[PDB]
């Protein structure tokens, strides 16, 4: 008979649920990401001077790498934090999006054709 | 050539020892390729 839109009424709840998990996680990231940028620029400059070997030649290659080694040792505990946060966010959004997808699979079925394919005359078809 | 098409081609849970065994296998394979003795590296090479 006449159809309630149960799926279309759950879709609007899923579409709201999606941003919140990742909202918390995004901010927690931006903190870490912002307390690591100087070290990352250090590492980039160091790798550049070690890999060109001809453009900034002021070093003793044995020490030019001890510096890079120490700097890499400094950045290591931040990568773990980033990995934990990324896995948390991944799981949360995965569940939420499975829900939203299962919904949209149905909201496209109980909607009249003329509302998604237009009237059979508003189609150019030369 | 065509590397990406040759290098590229479970909810049942695991006990503690099966998990440890599988993990040890994967770590050993990683260390195998990091020094150039893998059996998938050598065939393509």
């Amino acid at each position: 008979g006449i159809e309630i839109f149960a799926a279309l009424n759950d879709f609007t709840d899923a579409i709201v649920s999606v941003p919140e998990s990742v909202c918390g996680k995004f901010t927690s990231l931006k903190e870490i990401d912002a307390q690591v940028r100087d070290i990352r620029q250090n590492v980039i400059q160091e790798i550049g001077v070690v890999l060109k070997n001809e453009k900034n030649d002021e070093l003793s290659g044995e020490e030019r790498c001890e510096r890079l080694q120490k700097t890499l040792k400094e950045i290591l505990p931040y990568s773990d934090s980033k990995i934990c946060l990324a896995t948390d966010a991944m799981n949360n959004i995965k569940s939420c999006i499975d829900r939203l997808d299962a919904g949209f699979e149905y909201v496209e079925l109980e909607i009249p054709q003329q509302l998604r394919l237009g009237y059979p005359d508003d189609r150019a078809l030369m | 050539m065509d590397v990406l098409s040759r290098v590229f081609d479970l909810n049942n849970p695991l006990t503690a020892s099966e998990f440890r065994a599988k993990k040890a296998e994967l770590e050993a394979e990683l260390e195998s390729i990091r020094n150039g003795t893998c059996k998938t590296l050598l065939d393509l090479a």
Partner: protein
């Protein structure tokens, strides 16, 4: 002005609860795995350092009487008490988040109307 203040107090009270259950979910789900029986004296040390978050999660989900009971019983029978707590707390979290969505549907209208009509202390 007081209707707006009540809106703000209500959403604050939702937030503190949701945040507490979140952190406790995190820790407990960390304590649930296959290899947990192996390295237990390390997990048993990350539980003493977080006893307060889990105590508050229990106070919220059970009550101030069963809280001590569950805290002790988990201090002993850890690698099989942790999963049932995790299941309960996740169910509660899901339903409370679902509730907060549908009431935020209404807090917004309250704030619109009274934010307009509340800048008149004459």
């Amino acid at each position: 002005l007081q209707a707006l203040q009540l809106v703000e107090d209500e959403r604050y009270d939702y937030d503190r609860v949701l945040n507490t259950t979140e952190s406790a979910i995190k820790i407990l789900a960390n304590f649930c795995e296959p290899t947990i029986h192996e390295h237990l004296e390390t997990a048993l040390q990350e539980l003493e350092r977080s006893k307060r978050i889990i105590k508050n999660a229990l106070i919220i989900v059970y009550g101030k009487e069963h809280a001590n009971l569950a805290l002790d019983t988990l201090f002993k029978k850890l690698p099989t008490a942790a999963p049932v707590l995790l299941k309960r707390i996740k169910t509660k979290d899901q339903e409370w988040r679902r509730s907060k969505r549908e009431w935020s549907k209404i807090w917004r209208q309250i704030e619109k109307k009274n934010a307009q009509a509340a800048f008149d202390d004459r």
